[PDB]
Amino acid sequence: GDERFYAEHLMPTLQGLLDPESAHRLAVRFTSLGLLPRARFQDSDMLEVRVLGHKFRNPVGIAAGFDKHGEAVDGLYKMGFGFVEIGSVTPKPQEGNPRPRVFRLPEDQAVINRYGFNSHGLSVVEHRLRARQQKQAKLTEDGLPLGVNLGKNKTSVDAAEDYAEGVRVLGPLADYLVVNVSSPNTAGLRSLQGKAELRRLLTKVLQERDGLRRVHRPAVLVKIAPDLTSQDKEDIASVVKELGIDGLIVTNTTVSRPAGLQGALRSETGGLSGKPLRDLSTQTIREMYALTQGRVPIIGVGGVSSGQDALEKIRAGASLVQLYTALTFWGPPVVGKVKRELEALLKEQGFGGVTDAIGADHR
Numbered sequence: 001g002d003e004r005f006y007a008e009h010l011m012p013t014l015q016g017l018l019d020p021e022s023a024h025r026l027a028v029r030f031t032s033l034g035l036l037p038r039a040r041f042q043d044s045d046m047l048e049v050r051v052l053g054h055k056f057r058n059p060v061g062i063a064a065g066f067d068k069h070g071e072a073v074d075g076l077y078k079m080g081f082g083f084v085e086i087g088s089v090t091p092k093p094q095e096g097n098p099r100p101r102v103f104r105l106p107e108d109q110a111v112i113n114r115y116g117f118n119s120h121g122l123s124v125v126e127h128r129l130r131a132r133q134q135k136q137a138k139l140t141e142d143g144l145p146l147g148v149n150l151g152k153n154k155t156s157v158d159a160a161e162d163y164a165e166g167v168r169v170l171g172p173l174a175d176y177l178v179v180n181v182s183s184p185n186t187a188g189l190r191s192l193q194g195k196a197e198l199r200r201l202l203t204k205v206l207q208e209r210d211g212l213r214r215v216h217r218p219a220v221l222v223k224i225a226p227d228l229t230s231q232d233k234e235d236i237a238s239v240v241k242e243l244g245i246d247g248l249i250v251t252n253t254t255v256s257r258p259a260g261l262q263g264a265l266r267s268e269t270g271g272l273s274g275k276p277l278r279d280l281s282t283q284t285i286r287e288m289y290a291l292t293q294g295r296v297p298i299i300g301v302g303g304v305s306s307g308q309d310a311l312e313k314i315r316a317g318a319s320l321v322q323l324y325t326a327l328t329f330w331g332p333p334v335v336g337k338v339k340r341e342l343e344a345l346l347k348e349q350g351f352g353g354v355t356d357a358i359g360a361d362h363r
C-alpha cells in the first residue's frame with residue numbers, strides 16, 4: 001500500500017519538484033519531526049543480531065551521509081532502522097563543495113555526490129547528542145545502537161589528529177565509531193588506506209579509544225572504498241587483524257563508472273551510489289570476509305533496496321547492512337520492505353535467523 005504509493009507517486013513527484021540537495025534537506029527535516037508513516041512491521045526474533053558488543057533488533061541500518069549532523073536520529077529509528085550511523089563529522093565546521101554537488105541518475109537508480117564533508121563540526125554534534133544521551137542509552141539497551149562516522153577537515157595538516165579529536169569528542173557518545181578513509185571527495189583522503197600510514201593512523205585512533213572510560217568506550221570500524229586494488233585489500237585485512245580493529249564497513253561510493261550507465265549526469269565528478277554499486281560492494285564484502293577469515297564483523301553497504309540485496313551481502317559475509325540511496329527512489333517504506341523480504345528469504349533458504357546466514361556462501 002504505502003510502498004507502491006511512495007514508489008510510484010510521492011517520490012517521483014518530489015523529485016520532479018526539488019533538486020536532490022533540497023529534497024535531502026526536506027527529508028531530514030520531515031524525519032527529524034517524526035512526519036513519517038510509523039513503520040507497522042514488527043521485527044521478529046530471527047532478524048536479531050549480536051555483534052560489536054551490542055544487540056541489533058534488526059540488521060538494516062541507515063548509512064552515513066543521510067544524517068550528517070545528528071539531527072534526525074530518533075526519526076530514523078521510527079522509520080524502522082535497526083541502527084543509525086550519523087556523519088561524517090569533521091573537527092571544525094566546514095561548508096563542503098560548491099553547489100550543485102549531488103545528482104540523480106534515475107535510469108540507473110543511482111546518485112552521484114561530491115558534498116565534500118559539509119559538516120556542522122564536532123562541537124555542535126557533541127551537544128546535539130548530549131541532549132539525548134540517556135534516551136540513546138535506553139535505545140541501545142533495547143537493541144537500537146548508534147554509530148558515529150568521523151571525517152577530517154579539508155585544510156587539515158595531520159589526518160590522524162583529526163580522527164583522534166573525533167574519537168575524544170564523540171567516542172563517549174557512540175556505540176561504534178567509523179574511520180572513514182574512503183570518501184572520494186576529499187583530496188588525499190583515500191591514500192590513508194595504504195598500509196604504512198593506515199597502521200600509524202589506526203594505532204593512534206585505537207590508543208585514543210582505549211583511553212576512554214569503559215562505559216564510554218566504542219567499537220572502532222574502518223570504512224573502505226569499493227575501488228581498492230587487490231594489494232590494498234590484502235594490506236587493510238592484515239592491519240585490521242594486527243591491530244584488533246573491531247569491524248569493517250564495506251563499502252563507500254565508487255569513483256568508477258561501470259559500463260552501461262544511462263543517466264545524463266553519469267560523467268559528473270563524485271562518488272556513485274545505488275544499484276550500479278551493488279555487486280561491486282558485495283564482492284568487496286566477499287573478499288574482505290575471506291581475507292579476515294570471517295573473524296572481523298562486516299557492515300555491508302551499497303545498492304541495497306530489497307531483501308535479496310540484503311541477504312546476498314549477509315551470505316557474502318556481512319553481519320549487518322546499511323542503505324541510503326534506496327530511500328531517494330523508494331522513500332521510507334523501503335525499510336519495512338527490505339526487512340519483510342529478508343525474513344521471508346531466510347525462511348525459504350532454511351536459515352533459523354540472520355546469524356545463521358552470515359558468511360554462508362563461504363561454507
Ligand SMILES: COc1cccc(-c2c(F)cc(-n3nnc4c3C(=O)c3ccccc3C4=O)cc2F)c1
Pocket residue numbers: 011014015019020021023024025026027028030031035036102104111327328329331332
Ligand atoms: C512525507 O514522506 C517522507 C518522509 C520522510 C522522508 C521523505 C523523503 C525521502 F526519504 C527522500 C527524498 N528524496 N527525494 N529525492 C532525493 C531524496 C533524498 O533524500 C536524497 C538524499 C541524498 C541525496 C539525494 C537525494 C534525492 O535525490 C525526499 C523525501 F521527502 C518523505
Ligand SMILES: Cc1cc2nc3c(=O)[nH]c(=O)nc-3n(C[C@H](O)[C@H](O)[C@H](O)COP(=O)(O)O)c2cc1C
Pocket residue numbers: 063064065066068087088102111113115117149180183223251252253273274275277301302303304322323324325326
Ligand atoms: C549523498 C550521499 C552522501 C554521503 N555521505 C557520506 C559520508 O559523509 N560519510 C560516509 O562514510 N559515507 C557517505 N556516503 C556513502 C554511504 O554511506 C554509502 O556507503 C553509499 O552511498 C552506498 O550505499 P547506498 O548505495 O545504499 O547509497 C554518502 C552517500 C551519499 C549518496
Ligand SMILES: CCCCCCCCCCCC[N+](C)(C)[O-]
Pocket residue numbers: 107108109110258259275276277278279280
Ligand atoms: C557488474 C557491474 C555493472 C555495474 C552495475 C550494474 C547495475 C545492475 C542493474 C540493476 C539496476 C536496475 N535499475 C533500475 C537501477 O536500473
Ligand SMILES: O=C(O)c1cc(=O)[nH]c(=O)[nH]1
Pocket residue numbers: 065088113114115116117118180182183184185252253271272
Ligand atoms: O561528503 C561527501 O562528499 C561524501 C563522503 C563519503 O564518505 N562518501 C561519499 O559518497 N560522499
